[PDB]
Amino acid sequence: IETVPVKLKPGMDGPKVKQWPLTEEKIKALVEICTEMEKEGKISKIGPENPYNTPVFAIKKKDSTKWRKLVDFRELNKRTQDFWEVQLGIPHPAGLKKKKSVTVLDVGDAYFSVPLDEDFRKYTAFTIPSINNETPGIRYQYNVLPQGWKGSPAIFQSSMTKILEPFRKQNPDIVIYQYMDDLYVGSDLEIGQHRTKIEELRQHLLRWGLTGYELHPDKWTVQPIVLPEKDSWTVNDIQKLVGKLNWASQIYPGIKVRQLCKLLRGTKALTEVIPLTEEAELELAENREILKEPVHGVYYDPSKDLIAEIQKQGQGQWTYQIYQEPFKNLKTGKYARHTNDVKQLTEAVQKITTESIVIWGKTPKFKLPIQKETWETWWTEYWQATWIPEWEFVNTPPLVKLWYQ
Amino acid sequence: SPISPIETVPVKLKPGMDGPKVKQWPLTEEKIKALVEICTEMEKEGKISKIGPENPYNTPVFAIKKKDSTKWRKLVDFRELNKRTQDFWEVQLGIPHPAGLKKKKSVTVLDVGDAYFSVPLDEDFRKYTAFTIPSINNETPGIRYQYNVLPQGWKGSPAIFQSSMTKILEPFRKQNPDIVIYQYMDDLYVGSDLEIGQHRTKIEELRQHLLRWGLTTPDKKHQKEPPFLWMGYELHPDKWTVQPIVLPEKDSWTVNDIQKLVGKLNWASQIYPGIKVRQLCKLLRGTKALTEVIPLTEEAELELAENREILKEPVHGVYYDPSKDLIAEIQKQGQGQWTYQIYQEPFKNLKTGKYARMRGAHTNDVKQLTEAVQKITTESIVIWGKTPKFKLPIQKETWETWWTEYWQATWIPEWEFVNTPPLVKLWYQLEKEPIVGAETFYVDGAANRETKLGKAGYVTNRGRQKVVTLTDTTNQKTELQAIYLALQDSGLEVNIVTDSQYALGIIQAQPDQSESELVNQIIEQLIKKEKVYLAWVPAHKGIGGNEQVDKLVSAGIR
Numbered sequence: 002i003e004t005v006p007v008k009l010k011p012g013m014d015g016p017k018v019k020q021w022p023l024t025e026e027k028i029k030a031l032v033e034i035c036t037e038m039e040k041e042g043k044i045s046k047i048g049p050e051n052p053y054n055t056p057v058f059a060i061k062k063k064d065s066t067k068w069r070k071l072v073d074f075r076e077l078n079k080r081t082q083d084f085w086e087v088q089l090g091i092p093h094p095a096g097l098k099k100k101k102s103v104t105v106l107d108v109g110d111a112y113f114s115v116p117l118d119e120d121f122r123k124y125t126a127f128t129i130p131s132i133n134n135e136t137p138g139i140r141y142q143y144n145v146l147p148q149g150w151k152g153s154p155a156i157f158q159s160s161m162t163k164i165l166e167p168f169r170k171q172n173p174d175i176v177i178y179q180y181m182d183d184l185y186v187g188s189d190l191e192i193g194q195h196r197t198k199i200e201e202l203r204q205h206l207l208r209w210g211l212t213g214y215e216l217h218p219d220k221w222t223v224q225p226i227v228l229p230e231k232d233s234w235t236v237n238d239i240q241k242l243v244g245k246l247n248w249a250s251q252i253y254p255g256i257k258v259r260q261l262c263k264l265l266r267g268t269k270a271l272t273e274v275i276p277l278t279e280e281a282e283l284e285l286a287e288n289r290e291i292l293k294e295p296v297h298g299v300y301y302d303p304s305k306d307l308i309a310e311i312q313k314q315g316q317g318q319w320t321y322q323i324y325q326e327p328f329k330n331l332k333t334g335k336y337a338r339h340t341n342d343v344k345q346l347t348e349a350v351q352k353i354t355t356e357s358i359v360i361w362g363k364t365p366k367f368k369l370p371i372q373k374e375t376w377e378t379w380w381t382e383y384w385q386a387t388w389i390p391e392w393e394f395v396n397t398p399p400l401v402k403l404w405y406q
Numbered sequence: 407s408p409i410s411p412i413e414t415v416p417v418k419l420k421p422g423m424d425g426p427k428v429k430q431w432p433l434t435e436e437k438i439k440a441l442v443e444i445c446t447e448m449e450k451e452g453k454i455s456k457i458g459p460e461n462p463y464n465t466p467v468f469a470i471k472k473k474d475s476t477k478w479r480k481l482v483d484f485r486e487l488n489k490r491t492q493d494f495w496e497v498q499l500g501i502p503h504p505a506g507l508k509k510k511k512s513v514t515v516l517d518v519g520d521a522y523f524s525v526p527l528d529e530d531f532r533k534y535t536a537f538t539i540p541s542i543n544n545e546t547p548g549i550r551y552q553y554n555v556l557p558q559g560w561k562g563s564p565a566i567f568q569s570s571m572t573k574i575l576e577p578f579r580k581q582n583p584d585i586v587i588y589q590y591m592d593d594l595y596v597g598s599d600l601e602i603g604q605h606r607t608k609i610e611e612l613r614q615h616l617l618r619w620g621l622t623t624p625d626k627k628h629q630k631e632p633p634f635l636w637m638g639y640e641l642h643p644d645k646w647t648v649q650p651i652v653l654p655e656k657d658s659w660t661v662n663d664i665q666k667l668v669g670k671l672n673w674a675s676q677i678y679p680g681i682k683v684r685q686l687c688k689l690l691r692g693t694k695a696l697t698e699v700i701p702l703t704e705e706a707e708l709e710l711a712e713n714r715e716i717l718k719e720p721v722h723g724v725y726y727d728p729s730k731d732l733i734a735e736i737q738k739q740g741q742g743q744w745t746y747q748i749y750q751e752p753f754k755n756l757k758t759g760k761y762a763r764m765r766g767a768h769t770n771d772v773k774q775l776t777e778a779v780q781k782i783t784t785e786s787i788v789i790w791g792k793t794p795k796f797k798l799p800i801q802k803e804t805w806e807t808w809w810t811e812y813w814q815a816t817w818i819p820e821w822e823f824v825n826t827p828p829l830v831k832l833w834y835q836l837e838k839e840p841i842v843g844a845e846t847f848y849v850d851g852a853a854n855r856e857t858k859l860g861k862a863g864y865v866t867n868r869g870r871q872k873v874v875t876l877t878d879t880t881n882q883k884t885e886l887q888a889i890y891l892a893l894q895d896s897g898l899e900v901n902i903v904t905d906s907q908y909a910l911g912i913i914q915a916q917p918d919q920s921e922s923e924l925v926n927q928i929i930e931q932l933i934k935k936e937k938v939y940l941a942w943v944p945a946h947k948g949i950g951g952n953e954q955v956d957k958l959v960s961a962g963i964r
């Protein structure tokens with residue numbers, strides 16, 4: 002198959018990313034996987050004259066003993082962005098988030114039978130490190146479209162299309178969207194029929210080699226910021242209620258505090274109850290009334306990155322906000338749980354990403370409330386997706402935490 | 407010396423760049439003669455080849471005499487070619503740590519004779535290695551050669567040689583899975599668990615295999631004997647340890663003696679537990695010249711002394727047995743200093759180490775402990791490919807309290823409490839609730855960006871009040887000050903309300919030590935207290951007594 006030519010974004014070249022250390026079991030698992038792909042021609046060893054590097058990891062994927070290989074092409078993707086996005090870009094259906102059911106299907110086996118443009122292969126180098134640096138890393142590059150590289154589905158686009166043409170023709174009202182190695186398939190069918198349509202579609206893929214897990218978007222409604230109801234209001238409680246109320250506007254067009262505010266004047270004991278003026282209750286309720294409403298005036302801007310913040314809330318709970326411009330939330334929610342802090346954070350991160358994929362067709366840059374080294378040493382222990390979002394590390398403002406409680 | 411027949415590694419210059427052409431400076435006749443003698447020998451041996459003046463490339467040649475001796479050495483200055491050669495893959499990304507080597511029954515060291523010359527250079531590349539021995543004065547075209555093997559000091563040599571050595575070993579390895587060979591520069595470390603018998607045999611088979619590829623090596627009675635010194639260590643049949651360390655007897659210390667000392671101690675600390683260095687380091691900050699003498703602080707002295715004590719008499723580390731566990735223990739040593747040992751069998755250490763780093767400005771023992779655990783955890787994966795079971799000086803309960811309530815996500819692999827004081831603990835808890843019948847202080851601070859003068863003070867709710875002035879501060883400073891007052895004038899129980907998310911943040915984290923003197927005082931207060939409750943309100947929103955302490959510290963400042 003004559004290959005399509007792939008070039009970097011002018012004036013910059015290949016990834017040179019360092020390989021995190023791996024434990025013995027993951028290294029072994031990677032040696033097997035890699036000996037096999039080589040025998041099958043998917044990848045070939047390279048020599049010292051290839052200076053590039055992309056990190057590689059081993060994961061499991063939900064309910065599976067089989068180790069599976071995961072290449073981190075985050076860097077490569079940035080460096081070829083112009084190719085996969087605005088040259089062979091894949092349109093993203095606004096309809097998808099609407100469907101009652103979306104099944105997500107791994108379809109990355111497709112890629113290994115399309116050869117990779119010979120002049121690009123070197124940019125896909127990776128290394129299998131060894132313990133205690135006893136031996137030099139085993140070094141490889143790809144001969145075929147690699148999983149996890151945003152180039153693969155861009156290139157495989159038209160084949161995907163031929164494969165899906167029959168099934169599509171026969172099901173005008175099912176939406177199929179591809180993103181990296183995955184297929185998103187959403188319908189409004191009863192769930193038995195849905196699952197049945199997905200089986201049917203598995204058979205099509207099955208005729209070209211390719212070989213589900215279930216979302217329900219149309220029911221992802223708001224995580225409205227909540228104020229307390231309660232008979233009896235301490236100086237402290239009100240203090241807190243206006244802190245929260247105060248912060249709430251800035252994003253919430255026309256939140257009010259005046260009335261509420263008056264209640265506190267002079268310098269009283271904190272533990273002193275106080276009555277209420279029922280016009281203060283008027284605010285409260287409208288505020289509340291508002292606090293449950295889509296932000297007025299905020300809109301996805303396709304040309305800007307998506308950002309996600311996550312706060313730890315104890316008792317297995319985590320809150321999060323997606324936005325492009327601070328305090329202009331496109332979306333907010335929570336994630337809730339033998340599960341430690343890192344394990345859960347990793348789960349929330351995945352869940353949010355995949356929501357973000359369904360809605361916008363791009364993944365958010367994450368701000369993680371955790372220390373780099375911990376995250377880096379632990380995340381693959383629980384990671385199950387075949388992609389990897391970008392992330393930073395941060396310290397939660399103390400207040401953000403409760404203003405989202 | 408043979409020139410390995412092995413496949414060549416293709417090499418390129420950097421895109422949009424051409425080979426070098428730096429002019430050859432004129433040499434003295436003795437220099438000129440020495441080079442002619444050196445080159446024709448190399449030429450005879452195949453290492454170089456003469457070329458015409460059609461080739462347009464050139465790299466300076468020089469010739470130096472001998473540190474002491476009476477031979478000549480030829481220097482080729484590959485800077486220019488080096489700046490034009492592609493990048494290669496990093497040679498070796500880390501070096502084994504001795505504590506990670508498995509014990510072998512028998513081990514022997516081979517080294518390759520003339521590593522670089524034994525291996526060929528991509529043909530289409532040689533032309534760029536052109537050099538010119540000039541004639542006597544300008545006259546005459548010089549003599550012109552180019553390389554056929556890896557040149558000394560060219561950018562690609564380390565990578566291709568080692569890449570070559572791998573290619574060449576691969577099979578032998580294959581048909582010898584139970585023999586480990588370690589490649590370092592032009593040394594080979596070869597160990598197995600065969601009785602000396604076909605260890606030597608097996609060695610011989612290795613040698614032949616090497617010689618078959620144009621690589622020659624010593625033979626029995628030629629090979630180093632253990633301990634093999636290496637990378638700073640000493641390797642023995644049953645143990646390893648750092649190479650001899652000597653702390654000089656010295657009346658006066660210059661910056662430079664202390665820098666060196668600190669370096670030997672650090673190195674020493676991979677196997678000598680308890681080595682300390684803080685006091686010594688303290689001396690170095692804000693430094694003067696290398697030649698400057700520094701008077702040894704008294705702590706620095708006790709520190710130096712306790713260090714000579716530790717070094718008094720040898721300590722060694724054991725090698726690694728993959729069929730047993732890894733236990734790591736950590737002790738708090740003090741002023742942000744942590745110490746650790748890793749072993750498999752109670753008290754026979756594989757290695758030791760320390761962790762001090764100040765991570766942040768304000769911090770507490772519990773945060774430090776778990777930072778040390780992270781750092782030790784990463785190190786284990788590198789060295790042994792698994793994490794150790796931890797033994798820590800902190801109750802399960804304390805840990806559970808802290809992790810559970812802290813904003814940031816945390817984790818720690820398998821551990822167990824071990825009772826070795828000083829134990830790790832939180833030195834105070836903030837309340838979750840306002841304290842009934844304890845005075846509320848509403849504190850506040852303000853600073854003038856111009857004058858840098860600031861006021862700080864408070865107003866309680868039993869009508870008490872106070873305002874102090876400060877002369878070269880900042881808002882952050884006035885707000886800690888204000889909280890520090892409210893803590894000075896309130897006795898055992900108090901509710902405090904600030905509008906400084908900044909101070910709040912710091913204090914909610916239960917710092918138990920800081921770089922800020924002020925923050926420390928705040929800490930001794932918090933520890934003296936008996937029930938402190940701290941709470942935040944947004945400033946400049948006419949609110950509680952906040953609005954009053956505001957106007958109070960604003961009058962004058964802004």
Ligand SMILES: NS(=O)(=O)c1ccc(NC(=O)CSC(=O)N2CCCc3cc(Cl)cc(Cl)c32)c(Cl)c1
Binds near residue numbers: 135507
């Ligand atoms: N030949 S011997 O006197 O019996 C003898 C046996 C074992 C040892 N040491 C060991 O068993 C552990 S170290 C070892 O075998 N190897 C081979 C594996 C990697 C490696 C790397 C380095 Cl840097 C040094 C050595 Cl000495 C090694 C020594 Cl120093 C000497």
